[model samples]
Target: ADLSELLKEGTKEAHDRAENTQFVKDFLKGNIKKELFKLATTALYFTYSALEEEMERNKDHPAFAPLYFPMELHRKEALTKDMEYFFGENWEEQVQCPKAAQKYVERIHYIGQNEPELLVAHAYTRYMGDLSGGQVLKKVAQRALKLPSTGEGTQFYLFENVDNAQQFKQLYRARMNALDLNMKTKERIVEEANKAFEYNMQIFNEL
Candidate 1:
């Protein structure tokens, strides 16, 4: 089977764990407060900030080459705008990475420093999930918060340069499946992908 498919299948249970978390379900139903979503964004800023920083640092590494799509998927700037919109001019002062987020950031940093290939797992778990369910959450958030239609508050989910997300996802998966990893290393990536889900769940639980 294709490695991308295997990664998807192997991480199916973990993916469900993340999607079915009470926090996600409640947020999807528009039951959570706007602050909750902002909180989610705040937690995510730490994650993406750390991950993307590592991506830039490790871009020249061999492991990062296959999955390098920074221009199309990077979130630091968008997340910065979202944070400012949600938390005001001193958003950085009000924002702090929760314990779970700190742990997640640490994991990404560790992988970048010691085992850079494992970075693929974190990239897959986050960017793909963002491209997939994030759009649905975007609509829910706008409706839940009664925000304007201009997508001002939810820039995190909006991919400005990506015209065809489905095609882009296909390209991403193709790159993942085509990586130079052997079976053993691919399995490790799959396992770490699941762990990535757990990290996300930890953040959700903290919220």
Candidate 2:
């Protein structure tokens, strides 16, 4: 009955496909190179900047308001720190959005401008996946890259405002289920989420 259930069930295959992508498989195996990791970080910076900008634009919309937990879930600021750590203070000048990531960014802007209700799908796919696998990936990155234990490079995985990720995720899902959307809208949200997964996979393939 709840939207969260529909999304989880609907996106399962896409989620599996995303995880099985070569880049993600290599990443999980700790076989990632520093240069590729830096490129991946750049793509993420571009992706999240677009996602957060659109989210902020639609924060007050009824379909998206409940899910607007910027303090707890936003990653743009955290990604900025990661960019600086990986690319120096002049990271802003050095980094460019890859072609695949630019496609994802444009889609996010389109949704936010013309189909704001669908924003929840992008939010759900990224933030929920982040909370779910962030720590595992962080550990892999640290061990593989020999990053400092102080967490400088992997800052994007850190959720400073969230005291407990598990609890926060539960709250997030509950909020998702509580959104005032019709059945048709919820289906569209699930479809959009799968598309988000596809965009993510395309970026991985490009990397």
Candidate 3:
């Protein structure tokens, strides 16, 4: 099978597991508390800050070189903006990464420094998930938190450059399949993708 099929098939269970985790289940229903929502946003802010930074550092790596769609996919700055909107002007000082999130961030940097190829797995897990369920969470947050329908608090889910998310996701999967990777390397990517789901689920468990 191709890389896309392998990734989708290999990660499906992990993906569903993460999605159905209590934190996410409540999040989808907008049934979470203020503190949990704040913590979730803080966790995301820290995680994306680390992931995007590593992506920048590894943009030149042969594996990441072809996947350089930073302008369209970068989340750190958007996350920062969302943080300020959620926390205040001093959002940076106010927020901290929960222990699980810290571990996830470390894994991102670890892969960037030691195994750049695996960064693709992190990218695949985060960005594609964001493009998919992130949109649903946007509505849930707006309604659950009583936030304005405006983009202020939901910028994290807004894909500014991508006109159609479904189409963009298709393109993203295609790119993953097109990477110059043999079956062994592709299998490694799939394993790391599952690990990515586990890391995310740990973050939820912590909350």
All candidates in order of lDDT, best leading: 2, 1, 3
lDDT of 1 at 205: 85
* Cα error of candidate 2 at position 152, Å: 1.1
What is the TM-score of each predicted model, taking all chains together?
A: 0.95, 0.97, 0.95
What lDDT tens digits, residue by residue, belong to model 2 across residues 126-173? 998898888889999999999998999999988778888889889989
Candidate 1 TM-score, C-alpha based: 0.95
Runs with alpha carbons beyond 4 Å of true place in candidate 3: none
lDDT of 1 by residue, 1-24 (tens): 577888878999999878879898
Collision count for each candidate, in order: 0, 0, 0
Q: Cα miss at 186, model 1 (Å)? A: 0.5
Best candidate, TM-score: 2
Q: Rate the local accuracy (lDDT) of all candidates.
A: 0.86, 0.92, 0.85
RMSD of 2: 0.9
- What lDDT is obtained when candidate 2 is compared to the true structure? 0.92
List runs of model 1 lying over 4 Å from the truth: none
